[PDB]
């Protein structure tokens, strides 16, 4: 469990790990935005 | 149904999932070197 001073920020900590997958998808989206030039 | 922990989960997930596409859309709106 988190320390009680930061226990309210648990949902952000839950979301945080999967963010590099979103970076990979962001690279794909950026290539989609330029038309895969 | 309405849980504040689940509500904050969805809010944080929405912000995370829409931050990057917001960056791309805003750079495309300013006509930057995308």
């Amino acid at each position: 469990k988190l320390p009680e001073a930061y226990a309210v920020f648990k949902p952000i900590i839950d979301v945080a790990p999967v963010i590099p997958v979103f970076f990979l998808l962001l690279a794909f989206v950026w290539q989609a935005a330029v038309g895969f030039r | 149904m309405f849980n504040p922990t689940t509500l904050f989960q969805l809010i944080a997930l929405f912000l995370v999932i829409t931050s990057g596409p917001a960056i791309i859309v805003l750079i495309a709106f300013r006509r930057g070197n995308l």
Partner: peptide, 28 residues
Amino acid sequence: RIPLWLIATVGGTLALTVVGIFFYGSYS
């Protein structure tokens, strides 16, 4: 009218949302 990359992104997010609800129903 709308650029196709936005449509593809929205469709991919909706497909992943369908996958997520199916997995949640598999776990519940």
